[PDB]
């Protein structure tokens, strides 16, 4: 396997397609700013270990037990010790990051995505023989975290050469090195104040008075001048901000509401009320080639998230139903662990001129098609490379105790 659970290694995503020429989700239309008009406000985060140990002065034991923040033990997944999940708590009514969508109150929240992309460490699935994509999503429709029915999950898995241009600026990349000291593009590049100088090394300074002016998001506007571009949503101070997970107010599912913002995400002097979770610039390079590669060679791998799911369903496998997990307060629920397996050499809606797996990069997530919150918790999301090279739906798994201990 090649683990892919890194909560920090993901980041915002270029807005998708469903076939190379399509404008649903408002994409391949960069002429205007109507590019993130369909973007919800999902988050991604591992519930940090300071909630189950000696707790903060916020959440009590009543919120650590509602099956979206439950401290899944390894025993609970693999009936052979704590499993660090990777949530994707998706908010298809929260306007997400950068977009001045004027109405955003009549459009169906089903027509809003939430983007996340990675940068695969190893290309060329041919040489590596990357066969499957496996993971252990929680069946979200169980006790204490049961989102009501009528969600109709459409988690996509664009696994191609996804456009690394997160915030479509006209092929202008983006970095630190902002402020009045530096120079920017003569016109504001339709989103912000994208600087005019090439990134020598992606890293801030250490002058705390300076870094406070550099990290201003993926726009360049310091959130005090964002009201000049985001006009209709202006006078709300805005498009993006940041809040430390142990600084916000509410349940653990909601403290990670804005623990993905880019503005203030790199505060110096770690012993602050608002830490950063990164000391890296807020740049539009997921792979750090020092370039963007604004291309689209996808391989969609759709998934449904329905109320009920057998094993013969979309790509499901061994479901691993649990019975009575002692929740932290006094309770116990019935959780499900529907494992999936998307065969990588069987795409669905190949976008662009991609033809073979000789070079792959930038896997990408979604949560499109919802109507309320969803907190899909990937127990172990993972590209799993075979080692056996198959020479009638002939297939080759590798049955293991921990995986198929409940086949």
GROMACS .gro file of C-alpha atoms in nm:
model
  407
    1UNK     CA    1   0.000   0.000   0.000
    2UNK     CA    2   0.086   0.369  -0.025
    3UNK     CA    3  -0.077   0.552   0.265
    4UNK     CA    4  -0.273   0.866   0.181
    5UNK     CA    5  -0.419   0.976   0.516
    6UNK     CA    6  -0.203   1.286   0.561
    7UNK     CA    7  -0.452   1.538   0.697
    8UNK     CA    8  -0.230   1.835   0.613
    9UNK     CA    9  -0.099   1.713   0.277
   10UNK     CA   10  -0.434   1.775   0.107
   11UNK     CA   11  -0.543   2.122   0.000
   12UNK     CA   12  -0.803   2.310  -0.201
   13UNK     CA   13  -0.882   2.186  -0.548
   14UNK     CA   14  -0.932   2.326  -0.893
   15UNK     CA   15  -1.298   2.301  -0.972
   16UNK     CA   16  -1.389   1.982  -1.161
   17UNK     CA   17  -1.547   1.850  -1.477
   18UNK     CA   18  -1.764   1.545  -1.539
   19UNK     CA   19  -1.656   1.532  -1.905
   20UNK     CA   20  -1.396   1.759  -2.068
   21UNK     CA   21  -1.652   2.000  -2.212
   22UNK     CA   22  -1.891   2.070  -1.924
   23UNK     CA   23  -1.987   2.377  -1.723
   24UNK     CA   24  -2.178   2.221  -1.436
   25UNK     CA   25  -1.984   2.320  -1.125
   26UNK     CA   26  -1.907   2.627  -1.345
   27UNK     CA   27  -1.570   2.515  -1.477
   28UNK     CA   28  -1.363   2.566  -1.790
   29UNK     CA   29  -1.502   2.919  -1.769
   30UNK     CA   30  -1.210   3.130  -1.649
   31UNK     CA   31  -1.300   3.445  -1.844
   32UNK     CA   32  -1.498   3.570  -1.544
   33UNK     CA   33  -1.487   3.511  -1.170
   34UNK     CA   34  -1.780   3.267  -1.193
   35UNK     CA   35  -1.543   2.981  -1.117
   36UNK     CA   36  -1.603   2.902  -0.751
   37UNK     CA   37  -1.969   3.004  -0.753
   38UNK     CA   38  -2.042   2.636  -0.696
   39UNK     CA   39  -1.813   2.557  -0.403
   40UNK     CA   40  -1.925   2.442  -0.059
   41UNK     CA   41  -1.721   2.483   0.258
   42UNK     CA   42  -1.591   2.139   0.340
   43UNK     CA   43  -1.307   2.080   0.583
   44UNK     CA   44  -1.047   1.809   0.626
   45UNK     CA   45  -0.885   1.730   0.955
   46UNK     CA   46  -0.779   1.460   1.194
   47UNK     CA   47  -0.950   1.510   1.529
   48UNK     CA   48  -0.639   1.600   1.722
   49UNK     CA   49  -0.545   1.388   2.024
   50UNK     CA   50  -0.616   1.671   2.266
   51UNK     CA   51  -0.985   1.597   2.281
   52UNK     CA   52  -0.988   1.240   2.417
   53UNK     CA   53  -0.704   1.288   2.664
   54UNK     CA   54  -0.731   1.566   2.925
   55UNK     CA   55  -0.986   1.777   2.742
   56UNK     CA   56  -1.011   2.149   2.669
   57UNK     CA   57  -1.238   2.389   2.855
   58UNK     CA   58  -1.481   2.388   2.563
   59UNK     CA   59  -1.637   2.060   2.455
   60UNK     CA   60  -1.762   1.832   2.729
   61UNK     CA   61  -1.803   1.455   2.703
   62UNK     CA   62  -2.137   1.509   2.525
   63UNK     CA   63  -1.984   1.596   2.186
   64UNK     CA   64  -1.703   1.338   2.178
   65UNK     CA   65  -1.960   1.059   2.146
   66UNK     CA   66  -2.179   1.138   1.843
   67UNK     CA   67  -2.012   0.895   1.602
   68UNK     CA   68  -1.845   1.162   1.390
   69UNK     CA   69  -1.592   1.236   1.667
   70UNK     CA   70  -1.562   0.905   1.846
   71UNK     CA   71  -1.192   0.805   1.873
   72UNK     CA   72  -1.209   0.495   1.656
   73UNK     CA   73  -0.983   0.226   1.799
   74UNK     CA   74  -0.789  -0.008   1.573
   75UNK     CA   75  -0.974  -0.296   1.741
   76UNK     CA   76  -1.297  -0.142   1.614
   77UNK     CA   77  -1.182  -0.154   1.251
   78UNK     CA   78  -0.952  -0.454   1.244
   79UNK     CA   79  -1.076  -0.733   1.475
   80UNK     CA   80  -0.723  -0.872   1.478
   81UNK     CA   81  -0.439   0.080   1.868
   82UNK     CA   82  -0.609   0.411   1.788
   83UNK     CA   83  -0.699   0.484   1.426
   84UNK     CA   84  -0.631   0.841   1.313
   85UNK     CA   85  -0.914   0.903   1.069
   86UNK     CA   86  -0.934   1.182   0.811
   87UNK     CA   87  -1.266   1.362   0.809
   88UNK     CA   88  -1.413   1.552   0.517
   89UNK     CA   89  -1.688   1.737   0.703
   90UNK     CA   90  -1.875   1.893   0.413
   91UNK     CA   91  -2.095   2.203   0.447
   92UNK     CA   92  -2.295   2.248   0.126
   93UNK     CA   93  -2.458   2.568   0.247
   94UNK     CA   94  -2.162   2.761   0.382
   95UNK     CA   95  -2.040   2.943   0.068
   96UNK     CA   96  -1.698   2.782   0.105
   97UNK     CA   97  -1.376   2.961   0.019
   98UNK     CA   98  -1.334   3.230  -0.243
   99UNK     CA   99  -1.652   3.305  -0.438
  100UNK     CA  100  -1.886   3.602  -0.458
  101UNK     CA  101  -2.184   3.398  -0.574
  102UNK     CA  102  -2.462   3.661  -0.555
  103UNK     CA  103  -2.771   3.453  -0.479
  104UNK     CA  104  -2.641   3.128  -0.322
  105UNK     CA  105  -2.974   3.084  -0.145
  106UNK     CA  106  -3.193   2.946  -0.422
  107UNK     CA  107  -2.942   2.717  -0.594
  108UNK     CA  108  -2.979   2.357  -0.484
  109UNK     CA  109  -2.695   2.271  -0.243
  110UNK     CA  110  -2.668   1.949  -0.444
  111UNK     CA  111  -2.508   2.163  -0.716
  112UNK     CA  112  -2.206   2.253  -0.502
  113UNK     CA  113  -1.883   2.059  -0.462
  114UNK     CA  114  -1.604   2.055  -0.208
  115UNK     CA  115  -1.258   2.018  -0.353
  116UNK     CA  116  -0.945   1.857  -0.215
  117UNK     CA  117  -0.638   1.743  -0.405
  118UNK     CA  118  -0.306   1.581  -0.321
  119UNK     CA  119   0.019   1.535  -0.514
  120UNK     CA  120   0.104   1.169  -0.559
  121UNK     CA  121   0.462   1.095  -0.458
  122UNK     CA  122   0.502   0.826  -0.726
  123UNK     CA  123   0.383   0.871  -1.083
  124UNK     CA  124   0.375   0.590  -1.345
  125UNK     CA  125   0.122   0.343  -1.205
  126UNK     CA  126   0.240   0.115  -1.488
  127UNK     CA  127   0.580   0.065  -1.327
  128UNK     CA  128   0.438   0.062  -0.975
  129UNK     CA  129   0.132  -0.146  -1.060
  130UNK     CA  130  -0.114   0.067  -0.865
  131UNK     CA  131  -0.431  -0.141  -0.897
  132UNK     CA  132  -0.691  -0.031  -0.642
  133UNK     CA  133  -0.806   0.253  -0.420
  134UNK     CA  134  -0.923   0.126  -0.083
  135UNK     CA  135  -1.069   0.301   0.219
  136UNK     CA  136  -1.294   0.256   0.522
  137UNK     CA  137  -1.559   0.530   0.508
  138UNK     CA  138  -1.798   0.539   0.800
  139UNK     CA  139  -2.149   0.461   0.700
  140UNK     CA  140  -2.266   0.806   0.814
  141UNK     CA  141  -2.624   0.684   0.862
  142UNK     CA  142  -2.593   0.538   1.212
  143UNK     CA  143  -2.663   0.645   1.566
  144UNK     CA  144  -2.565   0.983   1.710
  145UNK     CA  145  -2.418   1.102   1.381
  146UNK     CA  146  -2.698   0.992   1.155
  147UNK     CA  147  -2.736   1.248   0.885
  148UNK     CA  148  -3.097   1.212   0.767
  149UNK     CA  149  -3.167   1.029   0.445
  150UNK     CA  150  -3.190   1.200   0.106
  151UNK     CA  151  -2.824   1.295   0.062
  152UNK     CA  152  -2.728   1.088  -0.245
  153UNK     CA  153  -2.352   1.087  -0.209
  154UNK     CA  154  -2.141   1.147  -0.518
  155UNK     CA  155  -1.787   1.139  -0.382
  156UNK     CA  156  -1.565   1.156  -0.690
  157UNK     CA  157  -1.200   1.057  -0.714
  158UNK     CA  158  -1.042   1.248  -1.003
  159UNK     CA  159  -0.707   1.070  -1.029
  160UNK     CA  160  -0.528   1.206  -1.333
  161UNK     CA  161  -0.310   1.509  -1.401
  162UNK     CA  162  -0.556   1.745  -1.228
  163UNK     CA  163  -0.513   2.119  -1.284
  164UNK     CA  164  -0.287   2.243  -1.005
  165UNK     CA  165  -0.427   2.596  -1.053
  166UNK     CA  166  -0.644   2.605  -0.741
  167UNK     CA  167  -0.782   2.957  -0.766
  168UNK     CA  168  -0.808   3.014  -1.141
  169UNK     CA  169  -0.617   3.338  -1.186
  170UNK     CA  170  -0.534   3.323  -1.554
  171UNK     CA  171  -0.238   3.084  -1.509
  172UNK     CA  172  -0.077   3.313  -1.250
  173UNK     CA  173   0.064   3.108  -0.968
  174UNK     CA  174   0.072   3.240  -0.618
  175UNK     CA  175   0.294   3.248  -0.315
  176UNK     CA  176   0.425   3.447  -0.020
  177UNK     CA  177   0.622   3.759  -0.093
  178UNK     CA  178   0.328   3.996  -0.075
  179UNK     CA  179   0.294   4.326   0.106
  180UNK     CA  180   0.364   4.690   0.027
  181UNK     CA  181   0.736   4.624   0.021
  182UNK     CA  182   0.712   4.393  -0.281
  183UNK     CA  183   0.570   4.444  -0.630
  184UNK     CA  184   0.250   4.292  -0.766
  185UNK     CA  185   0.095   4.256  -1.108
  186UNK     CA  186  -0.007   4.591  -1.255
  187UNK     CA  187  -0.376   4.496  -1.282
  188UNK     CA  188  -0.515   4.293  -0.997
  189UNK     CA  189  -0.530   3.949  -1.160
  190UNK     CA  190  -0.909   3.914  -1.127
  191UNK     CA  191  -0.881   3.743  -0.787
  192UNK     CA  192  -0.626   3.930  -0.580
  193UNK     CA  193  -0.274   4.075  -0.582
  194UNK     CA  194  -0.072   3.786  -0.728
  195UNK     CA  195   0.290   3.902  -0.696
  196UNK     CA  196   0.521   3.950  -0.994
  197UNK     CA  197   0.837   3.758  -0.905
  198UNK     CA  198   0.929   3.393  -0.927
  199UNK     CA  199   0.934   3.177  -0.616
  200UNK     CA  200   1.293   3.109  -0.519
  201UNK     CA  201   1.198   2.906  -0.211
  202UNK     CA  202   0.850   2.860  -0.070
  203UNK     CA  203   0.896   2.982   0.286
  204UNK     CA  204   0.816   3.296   0.484
  205UNK     CA  205   1.054   3.511   0.685
  206UNK     CA  206   1.071   3.514   1.065
  207UNK     CA  207   0.998   3.882   1.124
  208UNK     CA  208   0.662   3.851   1.303
  209UNK     CA  209   0.566   4.201   1.193
  210UNK     CA  210   0.630   4.099   0.832
  211UNK     CA  211   0.473   3.753   0.817
  212UNK     CA  212   0.150   3.901   0.953
  213UNK     CA  213   0.123   4.087   0.622
  214UNK     CA  214   0.232   3.806   0.389
  215UNK     CA  215  -0.005   3.521   0.473
  216UNK     CA  216  -0.324   3.676   0.341
  217UNK     CA  217  -0.474   3.373   0.170
  218UNK     CA  218  -0.475   3.241  -0.184
  219UNK     CA  219  -0.580   3.585  -0.304
  220UNK     CA  220  -0.322   3.831  -0.172
  221UNK     CA  221  -0.586   4.057  -0.025
  222UNK     CA  222  -0.533   4.087   0.351
  223UNK     CA  223  -0.905   4.038   0.430
  224UNK     CA  224  -0.936   4.410   0.493
  225UNK     CA  225  -0.930   4.485   0.118
  226UNK     CA  226  -1.113   4.171   0.004
  227UNK     CA  227  -1.429   4.383  -0.016
  228UNK     CA  228  -1.306   4.539  -0.340
  229UNK     CA  229  -1.331   4.215  -0.540
  230UNK     CA  230  -1.591   4.015  -0.349
  231UNK     CA  231  -1.842   4.297  -0.375
  232UNK     CA  232  -2.176   4.128  -0.305
  233UNK     CA  233  -2.028   3.932  -0.015
  234UNK     CA  234  -1.822   4.238   0.081
  235UNK     CA  235  -1.894   4.414   0.407
  236UNK     CA  236  -1.894   4.091   0.604
  237UNK     CA  237  -1.550   4.112   0.766
  238UNK     CA  238  -1.462   3.864   0.283
  239UNK     CA  239  -1.393   3.529   0.122
  240UNK     CA  240  -1.162   3.341   0.358
  241UNK     CA  241  -1.014   3.349   0.709
  242UNK     CA  242  -0.869   3.110   0.965
  243UNK     CA  243  -0.952   2.985   1.315
  244UNK     CA  244  -0.743   2.752   1.531
  245UNK     CA  245  -0.921   2.429   1.620
  246UNK     CA  246  -0.871   2.484   1.994
  247UNK     CA  247  -0.974   2.851   1.968
  248UNK     CA  248  -1.316   2.827   1.802
  249UNK     CA  249  -1.634   2.768   2.003
  250UNK     CA  250  -1.850   2.459   1.964
  251UNK     CA  251  -1.826   2.087   1.920
  252UNK     CA  252  -1.525   1.909   1.778
  253UNK     CA  253  -1.712   1.874   1.449
  254UNK     CA  254  -1.744   2.254   1.443
  255UNK     CA  255  -1.413   2.371   1.590
  256UNK     CA  256  -1.272   2.246   1.260
  257UNK     CA  257  -1.497   2.486   1.073
  258UNK     CA  258  -1.217   2.719   0.965
  259UNK     CA  259  -0.911   2.511   1.046
  260UNK     CA  260  -0.841   2.509   0.676
  261UNK     CA  261  -0.832   2.881   0.604
  262UNK     CA  262  -0.525   3.024   0.444
  263UNK     CA  263  -0.526   3.372   0.600
  264UNK     CA  264  -0.334   3.356   0.926
  265UNK     CA  265  -0.256   2.985   0.891
  266UNK     CA  266   0.114   3.045   0.957
  267UNK     CA  267   0.132   3.258   1.270
  268UNK     CA  268   0.482   3.291   1.418
  269UNK     CA  269   0.538   3.231   1.790
  270UNK     CA  270   0.362   2.894   1.822
  271UNK     CA  271   0.250   2.977   2.178
  272UNK     CA  272  -0.035   3.195   2.051
  273UNK     CA  273  -0.413   3.184   2.091
  274UNK     CA  274  -0.433   3.115   1.715
  275UNK     CA  275  -0.165   2.873   1.595
  276UNK     CA  276  -0.114   2.789   1.230
  277UNK     CA  277  -0.085   2.416   1.152
  278UNK     CA  278   0.165   2.510   0.879
  279UNK     CA  279   0.473   2.726   0.851
  280UNK     CA  280   0.473   2.702   0.470
  281UNK     CA  281   0.347   2.964   0.225
  282UNK     CA  282  -0.008   2.952   0.093
  283UNK     CA  283   0.104   2.865  -0.258
  284UNK     CA  284  -0.061   2.716  -0.566
  285UNK     CA  285   0.190   2.429  -0.602
  286UNK     CA  286   0.058   2.098  -0.477
  287UNK     CA  287   0.356   1.906  -0.618
  288UNK     CA  288   0.624   2.175  -0.569
  289UNK     CA  289   0.767   2.145  -0.918
  290UNK     CA  290   0.785   2.526  -0.894
  291UNK     CA  291   0.524   2.527  -1.173
  292UNK     CA  292   0.150   2.488  -1.204
  293UNK     CA  293   0.069   2.267  -1.505
  294UNK     CA  294  -0.281   2.403  -1.564
  295UNK     CA  295  -0.393   2.091  -1.752
  296UNK     CA  296  -0.683   1.847  -1.722
  297UNK     CA  297  -0.623   1.475  -1.781
  298UNK     CA  298  -0.862   1.317  -1.533
  299UNK     CA  299  -0.994   0.971  -1.449
  300UNK     CA  300  -1.319   0.999  -1.259
  301UNK     CA  301  -1.414   0.727  -1.012
  302UNK     CA  302  -1.762   0.806  -0.890
  303UNK     CA  303  -1.907   0.682  -0.562
  304UNK     CA  304  -2.258   0.697  -0.423
  305UNK     CA  305  -2.346   0.754  -0.060
  306UNK     CA  306  -2.700   0.622  -0.012
  307UNK     CA  307  -2.894   0.528   0.303
  308UNK     CA  308  -2.842   0.152   0.265
  309UNK     CA  309  -2.560  -0.036   0.095
  310UNK     CA  310  -2.506  -0.407   0.038
  311UNK     CA  311  -2.173  -0.553  -0.072
  312UNK     CA  312  -2.276  -0.593  -0.437
  313UNK     CA  313  -2.329  -0.217  -0.453
  314UNK     CA  314  -2.115   0.055  -0.616
  315UNK     CA  315  -1.766  -0.061  -0.520
  316UNK     CA  316  -1.834  -0.185  -0.169
  317UNK     CA  317  -1.675  -0.486  -0.001
  318UNK     CA  318  -1.675  -0.629   0.354
  319UNK     CA  319  -1.883  -0.392   0.563
  320UNK     CA  320  -1.765  -0.480   0.915
  321UNK     CA  321  -2.069  -0.384   1.120
  322UNK     CA  322  -1.996  -0.308   1.485
  323UNK     CA  323  -2.254  -0.362   1.757
  324UNK     CA  324  -2.184  -0.183   2.088
  325UNK     CA  325  -1.893   0.060   2.112
  326UNK     CA  326  -1.878   0.220   2.456
  327UNK     CA  327  -1.905   0.588   2.372
  328UNK     CA  328  -1.712   0.819   2.605
  329UNK     CA  329  -2.008   0.964   2.795
  330UNK     CA  330  -2.228   0.664   2.874
  331UNK     CA  331  -2.354   0.554   2.536
  332UNK     CA  332  -2.306   0.300   2.262
  333UNK     CA  333  -2.395   0.299   1.893
  334UNK     CA  334  -2.411   0.071   1.591
  335UNK     CA  335  -2.146   0.183   1.343
  336UNK     CA  336  -2.071   0.058   0.993
  337UNK     CA  337  -1.740   0.050   0.808
  338UNK     CA  338  -1.827  -0.003   0.443
  339UNK     CA  339  -1.493  -0.067   0.273
  340UNK     CA  340  -1.463   0.032  -0.092
  341UNK     CA  341  -1.237  -0.080  -0.375
  342UNK     CA  342  -1.227   0.121  -0.698
  343UNK     CA  343  -1.032  -0.074  -0.962
  344UNK     CA  344  -0.796   0.188  -1.099
  345UNK     CA  345  -0.772   0.028  -1.443
  346UNK     CA  346  -1.142   0.098  -1.506
  347UNK     CA  347  -1.216   0.471  -1.506
  348UNK     CA  348  -1.561   0.609  -1.574
  349UNK     CA  349  -1.554   0.955  -1.733
  350UNK     CA  350  -1.197   1.011  -1.855
  351UNK     CA  351  -1.155   1.386  -1.917
  352UNK     CA  352  -0.910   1.532  -2.164
  353UNK     CA  353  -0.653   1.340  -2.364
  354UNK     CA  354  -0.534   1.094  -2.101
  355UNK     CA  355  -0.495   0.741  -2.230
  356UNK     CA  356  -0.277   0.540  -1.994
  357UNK     CA  357  -0.138   0.534  -1.641
  358UNK     CA  358   0.222   0.599  -1.742
  359UNK     CA  359   0.216   0.919  -1.533
  360UNK     CA  360  -0.046   1.003  -1.269
  361UNK     CA  361  -0.059   1.277  -1.007
  362UNK     CA  362  -0.291   1.503  -0.810
  363UNK     CA  363  -0.564   1.278  -0.677
  364UNK     CA  364  -0.874   1.478  -0.589
  365UNK     CA  365  -1.186   1.440  -0.373
  366UNK     CA  366  -1.537   1.583  -0.374
  367UNK     CA  367  -1.860   1.565  -0.182
  368UNK     CA  368  -2.096   1.682  -0.454
  369UNK     CA  369  -2.469   1.625  -0.456
  370UNK     CA  370  -2.551   1.669  -0.087
  371UNK     CA  371  -2.805   1.882   0.097
  372UNK     CA  372  -2.665   1.910   0.452
  373UNK     CA  373  -2.354   1.824   0.651
  374UNK     CA  374  -2.169   1.501   0.587
  375UNK     CA  375  -1.865   1.383   0.779
  376UNK     CA  376  -1.726   1.093   0.578
  377UNK     CA  377  -1.444   0.963   0.795
  378UNK     CA  378  -1.187   0.769   0.593
  379UNK     CA  379  -1.063   0.496   0.824
  380UNK     CA  380  -0.777   0.410   0.590
  381UNK     CA  381  -0.784   0.574   0.248
  382UNK     CA  382  -0.512   0.419   0.045
  383UNK     CA  383  -0.375   0.353  -0.301
  384UNK     CA  384  -0.273  -0.011  -0.293
  385UNK     CA  385  -0.021  -0.118  -0.555
  386UNK     CA  386  -0.040  -0.478  -0.665
  387UNK     CA  387   0.268  -0.684  -0.730
  388UNK     CA  388   0.136  -0.949  -0.969
  389UNK     CA  389   0.053  -0.800  -1.309
  390UNK     CA  390  -0.256  -0.970  -1.452
  391UNK     CA  391  -0.159  -1.113  -1.787
  392UNK     CA  392  -1.450  -1.184  -1.863
  393UNK     CA  393  -1.401  -0.966  -1.555
  394UNK     CA  394  -1.075  -1.121  -1.443
  395UNK     CA  395  -0.954  -0.952  -1.124
  396UNK     CA  396  -0.680  -0.991  -0.864
  397UNK     CA  397  -0.704  -0.881  -0.502
  398UNK     CA  398  -0.469  -0.982  -0.221
  399UNK     CA  399  -0.686  -1.122   0.058
  400UNK     CA  400  -0.543  -1.041   0.401
  401UNK     CA  401  -0.651  -1.117   0.757
  402UNK     CA  402  -0.699  -0.754   0.858
  403UNK     CA  403  -0.881  -0.664   0.536
  404UNK     CA  404  -1.074  -0.985   0.468
  405UNK     CA  405  -1.107  -1.107   0.824
  406UNK     CA  406  -1.481  -1.068   0.778
  407UNK     CA  407  -1.528  -1.149   0.409
   0.00000   0.00000   0.00000
